[PDB]
Design a protein around this ligand. Structure first.
Ligand SMILES: CC(C)c1cc(C(C)C)c(S(=O)(=O)N[C@@H](Cc2cccc(C(=N)N)c2)C(=O)N2CCN(C(=O)C3CCN(C(=N)N)CC3)CC2)c(C(C)C)c1
Length: 241
């Protein structure tokens, strides 16, 4: 997260950290139920030197605050039983960049580990609404990750403006969130994390999945996120949640 600040401990109990065998933190995810997490499909694409698609190559840390303190009280460690990438995901266009990760063993709800609420299919997060992006990603484009979880406040951007800012690249499954002037944006390592939207009663709903961006916090290059409402039914049919 670029342009953010340290989150308070336990402030985002649904934020999950995903480590790949021997590589440390690679992606974030969100707790949506005792056995399921939501993340981005691009995190689980194999490459010649590592099978990111293999659930056994990953470890999920729930309740984590500081990467250098992964054993602290309240932190839970879990392995993945399965990784379900959206069948329509496209590595080139990045359309349908969303994934469901099934935990090997049930997460235990506590004050530091709590699921985020999922928005119904017809819900629309309005342009201009303040949203929160969180993660252990780089704090600068061309910088380094963060030990302490970061949070940044950004705003939903009009779809038309989004398409126009990134011509031939924005699909209806994507949503621009941030600022045209930059300043605050998610970045490398934040991929797969959730956008948290405070709703009518104070409860927080996932407004999106950190997907991609041209650089980070660059002027006229806001972060692009995968929408959640559009996948409510997909999530239900695959996870029962
Ligand atoms: C080599 C390619 C893919 C690549 C593309 C980009 C962008 C121009 C699209 C970049 S980047 O810096 O402008 N942006 C990163 C970091 C990022 C991430 C999320 C949000 C933001 C934001 N500013 N809001 C930024 C980026 O949008 N990605 C997405 C695409 N990407 C991948 O799909 C890799 C995932 C891991 N992997 C496998 N498991 N096989 C290889 C492919 C990497 C990060 C980069 C960076 C890494 C130099 C690379």
């Amino acid at each position: 997260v670029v342009g953010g600040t340290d989150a308070d401990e336990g402030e985002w109990p649904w934020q999950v950290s995903l480590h790949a065998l021997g590589q440390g933190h690679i992606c974030g995810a969100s707790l949506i139920s005792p056995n399921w997490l939501v993340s981005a499909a691009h995190c689980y694409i194999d490459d010649r030197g590592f099978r990111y698609s293999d659930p056994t190559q990953w470890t999920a840390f729930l309740g984590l605050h500081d990467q250098s303190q992964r054993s602290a009280p309240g932190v839970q460690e879990r392995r993945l039983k399965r990784i379900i990438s959206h069948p329509f995901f496209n590595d080139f266009t990045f359309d349908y960049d969303i994934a469901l990760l099934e935990l090997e063993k049930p997460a235990e709800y506590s004050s530091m580990v709590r699921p985020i609420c999922l928005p119904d299919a017809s819900h629309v997060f309005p342009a201009g609404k303040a949203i929160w992006v969180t993660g252990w990603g780089h704090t600068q484009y061309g910088g380094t990750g963060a030990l302490i979880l970061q949070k940044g406040e950004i705003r939903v951007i009009n779809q038309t403006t989004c398409e126009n800012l990134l011509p031939q690249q924005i699909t209806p499954r994507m949503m621009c969130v941030g600022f045209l002037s930059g300043g605050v944006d998610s970045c490398q390592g934040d991929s797969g994390g959730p956008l948290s939207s405070v709703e009518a009663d104070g409860r927080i709903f996932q407004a999106g999945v950190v997907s991609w961006g041209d650089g980070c916090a660059q002027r006229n290059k806001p972060g692009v996120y995968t929408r959640l409402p559009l996948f409510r039914d997909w999530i239900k049919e695959n996870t029962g949640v």
